[PDB]
Subunit: 243 residues, 3 copies
């Protein structure tokens, strides 16, 4: 298919086929997840269903839930493609499309979160929270269903990422290992950060409170950010100050 | 039931019933875990048994272990109620009782740890350690069975919490995301912190060594605390100093 | 057996036997994993196979994979014994050999990583990466298969350890809780630290970029190390400076 998503999906299939041919231990799994399907949405739903199933939640039920969401919500499909593109372009480990789809926990947790956010918006909050708990369980990514996130989002070593209930993340944001977008321990209300488009947040950075991180800004590794960071400026240190 | 625990349990049931009625995907799980029971202890034991089971440990075996502990140890029941109350009162996300019981990993890990501590005290240390490993596995909470913890304990994004073997935590303590109560790497002996009643420890704080954190004190996010913090004082920074 | 590995294995069996006799809930698991075998390699492969299996990867398949690797690669066996010795000697919690073998997530993740590294070297990279993902899943240890690590390695609260693709770790290194040996977010190339023999890296330390941490050096807890640390010097702070 000559369209963008079509081309990306075509690349995923070609890559999976080479991997299946070279590694017989993974061949059937690559066939059932990717090669037996004709869309990115169905393969992602299939994979997420298996990854997140539990004694509470059948893989076939989760498969249905994810597939229904992607089929009904064009913006979810656009976001998945944008996030695949972001990994292919910005991942320092230079991940391939199929490997991102199958193995990248940040990417997978993010797509699953978008469905949890939709459920949350559709007044299915118990289920949204159940899905959220599994995402945390399995992908070591804790994003509250009520968090708002854009697309073109890059994770890096997603383990231990925390994004609170009232946080907002723009487009084309990079969130590295052990980033916390959380609060001070204050109860209730808007208490989590607002991250502008194109922001890079370094490993181990904690950004606490309802503060603004300006578009294109960078936060240095290990920073504790408690104040607003202007657009296209760099904030670093504990406590963080502008450079 | 007009007593405190009875009232809390009554609230849990009412909430679970509304959730079951509104979300058919979760209705049977809410019935088996909560609505089919007549006590908090049995429902918590049932839930913990399922959460922590493995190919080594049957859910029915763990269910028995937890239920036996709660039925035989009044202080465990008091602590569970106190921790539910602490979440209901101090959780910034304003969690309901049933949602705390079912979904809050800090709360669940803590109750399970109290049983591991009891086993440890009852000279069943291999089993205590086996239970401890599962708690870490499943709830991302690493509390050594020999650690002593009070009640009214609040977690927040429990993932990656570490509490060492010789640590002591008082009552009504709040431990936020990625807190480490550990050691310097020195081998053996008393080497982990003593946390006073009512202490608040901010996200990412590391408190190392056998030092005293005074009652009512606060530790700022991202702090590295290597010295004693007096009661009702605030310590912040890397290295931490009193404000 | 009077040889070093033979003696260590003998100790593991004796310890497991005492644990099986004292704890009937664990007796069968200790029998199947340890007491029914006549080598450390077979018991470790058996255990790793069970720990890491998934719907994608049968425990019997993983058991074969690990056993084949250990039987064919003398250096893997030497490394496993060296790491057991390192825990027995340097673990602040004073772990026994059998408890290290069975319960220590750092130790287990490390041995499994050595097999992933071998697969990576043997041009089975899809499988190496699949194994790597499970190791991260189960042991909360994220070591890229292409990372090079020596032996006599000590972990401490391995949860959240991250070691990047181009990192190099020498012999007799101690890596404490929440250590990150990663990059700045820069894409491609050599971008991860080189850790000398005998280095101690404190809890929560982040070491970023292709920099040198000298032999015998120490990195203080919570440090952000962005520059070279000379041999047998101590680096501490955010940003880190030499003391």
């Amino acid at each position: 298919a000559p369209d963008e998503e079509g081309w990306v999906w075509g690349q995923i299939k070609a890559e999976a086929r080479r991997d299946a041919e070279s590694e017989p231990a993974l061949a059937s799994y690559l066939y059932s997840t990717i090669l037996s399907h004709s869309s990115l949405e169905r393969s992602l739903s299939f994979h997420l269903g298996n990854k997140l199933c539990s004694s509470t939640l059948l893989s076939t039920l989760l498969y249905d839930l994810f597939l229904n969401a992607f089929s009904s919500d064009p913006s979810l499909r656009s976001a998945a493609v944008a996030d695949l593109r972001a990994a292919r372009e910005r991942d320092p480990a230079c991940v391939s499309y199929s490997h991102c789809l199958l193995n990248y926990k940040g990417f997978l947790a993010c797509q699953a979160h978008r469905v949890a956010h939709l459920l949350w918006r559709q007044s299915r909050r118990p289920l949204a929270l159940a899905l959220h708990s599994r995402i945390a369980n399995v992908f070591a990514v804790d994003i509250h269903p009520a968090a708002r996130i854009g697309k073109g989002i890059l994770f890096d070593h997603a383990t231990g990422v925390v994004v609170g209930e009232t946080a907002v993340i723009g487009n084309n944001v990079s969130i590295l290992h052990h980033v916390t977008l959380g609060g001070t321990g204050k109860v209730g209300g808007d208490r989590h950060p607002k991250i502008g488009d194109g922001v890079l947040i370094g490993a181990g950075a904690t950004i606490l409170g309802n503060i603004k991180i300006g578009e294109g800004a960078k936060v240095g590794a290990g920073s504790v950010v408690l104040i607003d960071v202007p657009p296209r400026t760099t904030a670093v240190g504990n406590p963080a100050r502008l450079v």
